[PDB]
Amino acid sequence: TATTLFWRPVPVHVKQQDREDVLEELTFRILTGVRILRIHISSDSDLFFLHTLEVSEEDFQSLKNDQGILVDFASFPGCIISLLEKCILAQPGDSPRFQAVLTIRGGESVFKIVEINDCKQLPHITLAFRPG
Amino acid sequence: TATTLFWRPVPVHVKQQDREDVLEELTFRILTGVRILRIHISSDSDLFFLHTLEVSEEDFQSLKNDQGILVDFASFPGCIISLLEKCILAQPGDSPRFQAVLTIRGGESVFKIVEINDCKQLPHITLAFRPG
């Protein structure tokens, strides 16, 4: 009555005030179970770099209305996974390029996946994480 | 010291309160000259369906900051034209599909081009037009 859908490294542009922007390989673990969706971001080299998201079906309706999400809750993790794969596969010089960004705030972070083409940067998903 | 860059029909989903949604072939004429950008939307069958946008270099900096536009003013019309072409070429069943939408308000309209994929609707450009 629970399953891991994804457990892989992803290149993430980490942004934190008072620090230089860096690109880090961060591990994402996506779990579903009884319905909830849980995502953990960790670092294979920093035991205390830990960020978690937990979304219930209810919370999802909110997300769904704000970001033009067109799928149901059951299919949402697949949307996230397809975006993360585009981030993993992006190469220098690519256009369009998908990039993952994690902005660190006090007690909360914002994870987004954006598409950068020759004309515009477009957000595809934006999600709130908390430490731990 | 002036030039037409585009003069072609585009399929547009026209939305107006108190009317049913319709899909119309509307003619777009894009002009540049001395710098300004002018766009006219018309209908080959309704002499009084007329909407115009005029953008100066100054107005563009505003647009540029709000919608993540990554090009300079000189290259902006090409961005619009590339989006309009995707709308023209979209076929039933396509995914992703680009669609053009014109929402009619009192004395102003909003033109947008959106991308619809299996997961999300994404706006690529949003522009204000006025009658005439």
Question: In chain A, what are the domain boundaries?
Answer: 1-132
The experimental technique used to determine this model is X-ray
Query: Would you tell me how many other CB atoms lie within 10 Å of the CB of residue A28?
Result: 22
Please give the backbone phi and psi of residue B87, each rounded to the nearest 5 degrees, phi first: -65, -45
| Distance of alpha carbon A103 from the chain centroid | 11
B-chain CB neighbours of A79 within 8 Å are: 118-120
Report d(CA A110, CA A104) in Å as an integer.
7
Cα separation, B111 vs B127, whole angstroms: 5
Reported in sequence order, the residue ranges of chain A that DSSP labels E, i.e. its strands, are 2-16, 22-33, 36-43, 46-56, 97-105, 108-116, 121-131
> In chain A, what is the greatest distance between 2 CA atoms, to the nearest angstrom?
45
Q: Cβ–Cβ of A116/B70 closer than 8 Å?
A: yes
Q: Report which DSSP code applies to B17.
A: T
A&B contacts, CB < 8 Å: 45
Query: Is A120 close to B82, i.e. CB distance below 8 A?
Result: no
- Residue ranges of E strands in chain B: 2-16, 22-33, 36-43, 46-56, 97-105, 108-116, 121-131
B70 interface with A at CB cutoff 8 Å: yes
Four-residue CA torsion sign, A111, A117, A122, A125: negative
**Is residue B4 within 8 angstroms of chain A, CB to CB?**
no
Choose the closest CB to B121 out of A68, A117, A118.
Answer: A68
Two tokens, residue A102: 């994690």
SS3 assignment, position B132: coil
Tell me the backbone φ, ψ of residue A76, rounded to 5 degrees.
Answer: -60, -45
Contact between A4 and A10 under an 8 Å Cβ cutoff? The reply is no
Tokens standing for residue A10? 């992803």
Closest CA to B60 of B132, B128, B130: B128
Written as six digits, the tokens of B28 are: 């777009």
Burial label for B22, CB within 10 Å (0-12, 13-18, 19+), is: exposed
Identity (one letter) of the amino acid at B121? Q
Q: What is the resolution of this structure in A?
A: 1.2
N- to C-terminal Cα separation, chain B: 23
> Rounded to whole angstroms, how far apart are CA atoms B4 and B80?
14
Q: How far is residue B120's CA from residue B124's CA, in Å, rounded to a whole number?
A: 13
- Kindly give, in sequence order, each residue whose CB lies less than 8 Å from that of residue B67, ignoring residues fewer than 6 positions away: A120, B123, B125, B126
